[PDB]
Amino acid sequence: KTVLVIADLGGCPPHMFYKSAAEKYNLVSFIPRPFAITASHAALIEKYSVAVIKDKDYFKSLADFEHPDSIYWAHEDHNKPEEEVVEQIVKVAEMFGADAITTNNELFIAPMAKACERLGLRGAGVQAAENARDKNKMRDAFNKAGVKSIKNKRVTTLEDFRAALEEIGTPLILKPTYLASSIGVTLITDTETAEDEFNRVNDYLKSINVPKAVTFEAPFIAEEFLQGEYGDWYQTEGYSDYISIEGIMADGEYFPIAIHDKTPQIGFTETSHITPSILDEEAKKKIVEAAKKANEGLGLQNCATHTEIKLMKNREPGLIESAARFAGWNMIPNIKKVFGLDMAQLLLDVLCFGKDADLPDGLLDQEPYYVADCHLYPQHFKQNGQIPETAEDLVIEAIDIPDGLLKGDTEIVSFSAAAPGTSVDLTLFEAFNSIAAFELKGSNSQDVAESIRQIQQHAKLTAKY
Amino acid sequence: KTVLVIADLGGCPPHMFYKSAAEKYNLVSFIPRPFAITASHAALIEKYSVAVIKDKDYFKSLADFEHPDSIYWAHEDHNKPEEEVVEQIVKVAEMFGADAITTNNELFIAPMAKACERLGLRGAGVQAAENARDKNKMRDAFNKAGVKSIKNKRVTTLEDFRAALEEIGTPLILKPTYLASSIGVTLITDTETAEDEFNRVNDYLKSINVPKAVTFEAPFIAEEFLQGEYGDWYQTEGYSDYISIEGIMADGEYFPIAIHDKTPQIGFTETSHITPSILDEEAKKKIVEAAKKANEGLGLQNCATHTEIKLMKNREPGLIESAARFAGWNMIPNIKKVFGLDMAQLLLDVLCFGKDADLPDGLLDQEPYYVADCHLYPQHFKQNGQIPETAEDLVIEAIDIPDGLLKGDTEIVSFSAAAPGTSVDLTLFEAFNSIAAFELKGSNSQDVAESIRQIQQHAKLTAKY
Numbered sequence: 001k002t003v004l005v006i007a008d009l010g011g012c013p014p015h016m017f018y019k020s021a022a023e024k025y026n027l028v029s030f031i032p033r034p035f036a037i038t039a040s041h042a043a044l045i046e047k048y049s050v051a052v053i054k055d056k057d058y059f060k061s062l063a064d065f066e067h068p069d070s071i072y073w074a075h076e077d078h079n080k081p082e083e084e085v086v087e088q089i090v091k092v093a094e095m096f097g098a099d100a101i102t103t104n105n106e107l108f109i110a111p112m113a114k115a116c117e118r119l120g121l122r123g124a125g126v127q128a129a130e131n132a133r134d135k136n137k138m139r140d141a142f143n144k145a146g147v148k149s150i151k152n153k154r155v156t157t158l159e160d161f162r163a164a165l166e167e168i169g170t171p172l173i174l175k176p177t178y179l180a181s182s183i184g185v186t187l188i189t190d191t192e193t194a195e196d197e198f199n200r201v202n203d204y205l206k207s208i209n210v211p212k213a214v215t216f217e218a219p220f221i222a223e224e225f226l227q228g229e230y231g232d233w234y235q236t237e238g239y240s241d242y243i244s245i246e247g248i249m250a251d252g253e254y255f256p257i258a259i260h261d262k263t264p265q266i267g268f269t270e271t272s273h274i275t276p277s278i279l280d281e282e283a284k285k286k287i288v289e290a291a292k293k294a295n296e297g298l299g300l301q302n303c304a305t306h307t308e309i310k311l312m313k314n315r316e317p318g319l320i321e322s323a324a325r326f327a328g329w330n331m332i333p334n335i336k337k338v339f340g341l342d343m344a345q346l347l348l349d350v351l352c353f354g355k356d357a358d359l360p361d362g363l364l365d366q367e368p369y370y371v372a373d374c375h376l377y378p379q380h381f382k383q384n385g386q387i388p389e390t391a392e393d394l395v396i397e398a399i400d401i402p403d404g405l406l407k408g409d410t411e412i413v414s415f416s417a418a419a420p421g422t423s424v425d426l427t428l429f430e431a432f433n434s435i436a437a438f439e440l441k442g443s444n445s446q447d448v449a450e451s452i453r454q455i456q457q458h459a460k461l462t463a464k465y
Numbered sequence: 466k467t468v469l470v471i472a473d474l475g476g477c478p479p480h481m482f483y484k485s486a487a488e489k490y491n492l493v494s495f496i497p498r499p500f501a502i503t504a505s506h507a508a509l510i511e512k513y514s515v516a517v518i519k520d521k522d523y524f525k526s527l528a529d530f531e532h533p534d535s536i537y538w539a540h541e542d543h544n545k546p547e548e549e550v551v552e553q554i555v556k557v558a559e560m561f562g563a564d565a566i567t568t569n570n571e572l573f574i575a576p577m578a579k580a581c582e583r584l585g586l587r588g589a590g591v592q593a594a595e596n597a598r599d600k601n602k603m604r605d606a607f608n609k610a611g612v613k614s615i616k617n618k619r620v621t622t623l624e625d626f627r628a629a630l631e632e633i634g635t636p637l638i639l640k641p642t643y644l645a646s647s648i649g650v651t652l653i654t655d656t657e658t659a660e661d662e663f664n665r666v667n668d669y670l671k672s673i674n675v676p677k678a679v680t681f682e683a684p685f686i687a688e689e690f691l692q693g694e695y696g697d698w699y700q701t702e703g704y705s706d707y708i709s710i711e712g713i714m715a716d717g718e719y720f721p722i723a724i725h726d727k728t729p730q731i732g733f734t735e736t737s738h739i740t741p742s743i744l745d746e747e748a749k750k751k752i753v754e755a756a757k758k759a760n761e762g763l764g765l766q767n768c769a770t771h772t773e774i775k776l777m778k779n780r781e782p783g784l785i786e787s788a789a790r791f792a793g794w795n796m797i798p799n800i801k802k803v804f805g806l807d808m809a810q811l812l813l814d815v816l817c818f819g820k821d822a823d824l825p826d827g828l829l830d831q832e833p834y835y836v837a838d839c840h841l842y843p844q845h846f847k848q849n850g851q852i853p854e855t856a857e858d859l860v861i862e863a864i865d866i867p868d869g870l871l872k873g874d875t876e877i878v879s880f881s882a883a884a885p886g887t888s889v890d891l892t893l894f895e896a897f898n899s900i901a902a903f904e905l906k907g908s909n910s911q912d913v914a915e916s917i918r919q920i921q922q923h924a925k926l927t928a929k930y
């Protein structure tokens with residue numbers, strides 16, 4: 001079978017996805033945004049694809065041919081309307097006799113579903129992909145699905161925002177409807193300053209570059225803040241009052257795979273993911289039921305899902321959002337590390353063979369140990385005081401982890417820092433700015449989690465200011 | 466315009482060809498032999514092609530995806546008949562709306578010409594490409610063309626060889642009809658040992674891996690040795706009694722570009738190429754006339770040509786062979802370095818626009834200096850005595866050029882050696898075995914040539930035996 005991948009940023013990381021897919025399938029890669037592709041990613045695409053096509057419109061001089069080492073967000077214009085992007089995807093699938101189409105990138109999810117319908121291939125479903133990609137549509141589907149409902153309003157104007165804040169009250173979440181990675185996600189607690197907070201992220205949002213293929217009913221959604229009740233869920237310290245759960249939709253039925261515990265965010269910037277959750281079986285049953293109702297509520301047919309859930313009072317699961325694609329960072333690789341299951345291969349098996357794929361009957365269990373996937377940010381060193389608080393730029397020499405910081409049998413499997421010499425702008429939104437990553441493993445989850453907090457508070461930044 | 470390149474070994478090197486082509490054209494690359502592609506070559510193909518297709522039949526496990534750092538000859542099977550290879554090329558050109566097809570590899574020249582005819586694109590010409598690829602057909606075309614003629618016979622059997630040696634006498638050249646790089650090329654001078662010499666290279670030839678797409682009337686050609694008369698041509702020492710000349714056929718007319726001087730071969734293994742020739746204008750007029758008659762005699766329509774010519778008594782040019790593709794090593798890059806002319810771009814301009822291309826009217830001149838492209842071989846150190854004569858293997862630590870060795874204003878532009886640690890088998894045919902490469906430049910050609918001989922005799926090999 002031949003699988004077409006729409007290659008771009010995010011989701012199951014290139015270091016796993018290409019090799020995984022090429023094991024069992026003939027992979028063809030379509031690159032709609034050549035500029036979104038790093039040098040490492042380009043190498044992996046080249047290595048494992050039997051065929052590769054790039055959008056030739058995004059090559060005007062010989063330097064369009066350059067691949068950066070690192071990309072946190074694609075800044076260049078992509079100006080094709082969604083119908084045109086659909087027609088491209090279709091043309092490429094047809095060129096290669098594709099039996100399935102997949103993507104790891106949030107921004108191409110809606111057009112891909114349209115391409116699959118037109119080709120008679122398995123996909124998210126046209127309206128379902130739109131629901132999984134416009135947070136106002138999504139929140140409407142959730143409210144209808146008999147998970148916990150909350151108040152939410154479409155916001156374009158200061159007038160819209162004013163109305164929303166009056167109707168919803170504080171605390172209020174205001175966020176863009178069409179992005180990812182917590183971009184623009186703001187917590188409103190003060191009616192005195194709320195309107196300035198809006199004006200500010202409004203102006204910010206307009207500086208974010210997205211393809212014209214991305215459309216939305218209103219730029220913002222304002223909705224109730226879902227309050228966490230940590231102590232109603234976790235028995236030990238170390239985690240946060242949200243989780244994610246990774247699943248697969250197959251013919252419109254939800255198949256849970258694994259739940260990830262989290263460490264506390266820096267604002268809304270995510271910090272760490274632990275595979276699998278320490279939560280008891282009843283807690284996990286409730287999360288699974290919520291994710292099922294949410295994703296079936298969206299109408300999704302065949303895709304991976306990454307579903308985020310706030311752990312609220314009375315063990316009520318609150319839906320934050322759900323995507324029709326893989327979790328990012330190393331969450332999917334780490335499921336393979338722990339359980340032996342390759343969810344990338346499993347998705348492709350579903351796209352090609354439906355419920356003939358070997359879907360697990362329930363969450364994976366009998367984990368031999370826990371694995372943490374962790375990023376450090378300028379803020380861990382601002383909060384450490386190693387970076388002076390008022391600094392807009394810095395130059396990175398080294399990042400070191402002092403010894404002694406590990407609890408129990410917790411092991412550091414790997415550690416990677418930003419190269420000596422690297423330049424960091426501190427006006428930047430944090431989630432774009434991890435300057436180190438580490439993987440921990442341990443037999444005891446609470447020990448793993450404590451070690452993450454120790455590594456976080458004590459890591460050593462040597463840096464020219 | 467869209468150019469399809471059949472990507473494989475030899476010709477205009479990847480470090481020039483892809484970037485050159487992608488400057489002015491939309492490049493699509495077809496890889497019929499994934500195993501023939503080095504890691505550097507793969508990277509260049511990926512960087513400059515808007516689309517890439519590989520033959521998926523040559524991928525059975527995840528390690529078919531590996532690219533070696535270095536390949537001297539493709540060892541793996543390629544089992545498709547020529548008609549099947551033609552049909553592939555056609556299918557790919559049709560997929561991408563190719564306006565032209567080119568290749569740098571000798572072994573795909575015949576099928577490509579067939580694909581171009583069928584598609585109505587410019588090419589070598591079907592029978593002309595066959596003549597440029599079967600040395601018995603080639604030598605027959607040459608004899609007909611009114612360049613100097615010589616005796617030649619088709620050899621398959623010991624009986625055939627015996628007959629050929631009687632009819633031709635010594636000295637005799639016996640060589641495979643369908644290869645390159647002097648593989649199997651043998652000089653016969655002794656009727657006592659001639660039949661054993663045949664039996665030996667017969668058995669050797671059968672161990673050389675070529676695609677099934679390569680066919681030939683007889684495996685061997687035996688033909689008169691063309692005697693050189695150096696002193697009838699060159700006024701100074703430093704060169705050899707053969708040259709090459711690089712040209713372009715456009716609509717069946719020959720356009721000379723540049724003549725390369727050579728340093729003496731190690732047997733028939735080539736050693737160095739100097740851009741451009743020091744030969745006087747009359748000598749160059751005779752070479753050009755010979756190359757014209759030869760390549761027009763072959764019937765070639767639209768292609769690059771690399772034509773090798775023995776400098777014989779009475780300034781008679783002897784045809785050695787001619788290919789319907791670029792010279793290998795850095796001969797084509799070095800023409801650009803000296804004259805500013807990019808022959809890769811010029812070939813593509815001819816394939817797409819015919820004689821509307823900006824073809825020079827005669828050999829390029831007003832060279833600002835001479836550039837030498839030079840390889841060192843185990844033999845330069847065997848002959849130096851730095852490698853003991855009876856050694857079948859070695860391990861390379863370093864290769865050094867002592868200072869003092871440069872004549873006049875000759876400069877070393879660049880120097881590259883085999884990595885410390887590299888392993889070298891000395892049973893191997895020499896042309897496969899360069900362990901260092903250097904580029905010289907100088908204002909005075911005879912000084913450049915002398916410096917090459919000094920570097921050759923005195924270079925320092927540090928090596929574990």
Ligand SMILES: Nc1ncnc2c1ncn2[C@@H]1O[C@H](COP(=O)(O)OP(=O)(O)O)[C@@H](O)[C@H]1O
Nearest residue numbers: 173179180181182183185224225226268320321
């Ligand atoms: N209604 C909400 N209540 C509480 N937290 C929220 C809410 N909406 C978003 N968040 C927080 O902001 C983060 C990012 O918002 P999310 O809706 O997941 O958008 P994104 O697609 O940018 O990741 C979430 O992981 C969650 O911590």
Ligand SMILES: Nc1ncnc2c1ncn2[C@@H]1O[C@H](COP(=O)(O)OP(=O)(O)O)[C@@H](O)[C@H]1O
Nearest residue numbers: 638644645646647648650689690691733785786
């Ligand atoms: N008839 C010949 N007379 C003299 N030298 C020859 C003859 N044939 C081949 N050679 C020598 O052998 C080398 C390689 O042979 P050639 O015919 O060019 O085949 P290849 O395609 O292997 O390079 C030539 O560069 C030339 O030096």
Ligand SMILES: [Mg+2]
Nearest residue numbers: 179180181321
């Ligand atoms: Mg999201």
Ligand SMILES: [Mg+2]
Nearest residue numbers: 181182308321
């Ligand atoms: Mg999210």
Ligand SMILES: [Mg+2]
Nearest residue numbers: 644645646786
């Ligand atoms: Mg040859």
Ligand SMILES: [Mg+2]
Nearest residue numbers: 646647773786
């Ligand atoms: Mg030759």
